[PDB]
Design a protein around this ligand. Sequence first.
Ligand SMILES: CCO[C@@H](Cc1ccc(OCCn2c(C)ccc2-c2ccc(SC)cc2)cc1)C(=O)O
Length: 267
Amino acid sequence: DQLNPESADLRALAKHLYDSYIKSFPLTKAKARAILTGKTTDKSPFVIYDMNSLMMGEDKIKFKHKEVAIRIFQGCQFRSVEAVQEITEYAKSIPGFVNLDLNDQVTLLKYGVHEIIYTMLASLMNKDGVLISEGQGFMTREFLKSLRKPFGDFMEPKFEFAVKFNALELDDSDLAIFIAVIILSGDRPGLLNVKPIEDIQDNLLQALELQLKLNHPESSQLFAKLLQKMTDLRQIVTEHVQLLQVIKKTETDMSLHPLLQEIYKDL
Ligand SMILES: CCO[C@@H](Cc1ccc(OCCn2c(C)ccc2-c2ccc(SC)cc2)cc1)C(=O)O
């Protein structure tokens, strides 16, 4: 750790990513945690904890998307497609990203967006449930587990991931760099020019390590633990696609949103 022009550049990169992240993502972790504790001055979210409150909340909240379990399943797909858009806008602000070959930009987003979705879902989760509709609702973990087979399973691994990930106590300034690192992964299948991606990622990794050393004086293991989480996330994505296939095997009339079908196609 020294104050030299390289470290000043790395702090400027971290600040740029934070400022962009705040612009691209409506509900930050900082705001989400204030809502979850009730410390916000905003109105409380509507809590969905059973079938009755699900129906009352659908009448209260403007959801942009059958029976209950299918409606929730579809609402998650619609949120996912929205999130793809937000993450794409964020990726355009990562220095160097839009100068990569446009096919590599697309490949990096295809293989990275779900890892980012699950990372940022953790910001909205506690032990009891998840904030939905940019904080207007809160849907409980046990209500999700109560949905009829084969729909009662798919959020559980995401809550399990979140409980452990949230224990690391990252803030938005940390997360903005972490999710840039994930997007700039040079080992995604089918990339045309790996070296320029790795060069960007190495710089982001340096910015992340410096940020974590400055921002978390009471951990020295945090960077290594975050590299571990990046591997965990790929397992969560794969397991989710497998879950979706199982659902399709028995609910053959289910269909994924066409954009998710393309992302999952060669995945
Ligand atoms: C099954 C598809 O899974 C997806 C991956 C996936 C899984 C869960 C998920 O939570 C989203 C929960 N949320 C948020 C954070 C805002 C609005 C909703 C919401 C509001 C209302 C409802 S229904 C009243 C549902 C959701 C987002 C993406 C994929 O494979 O791309």
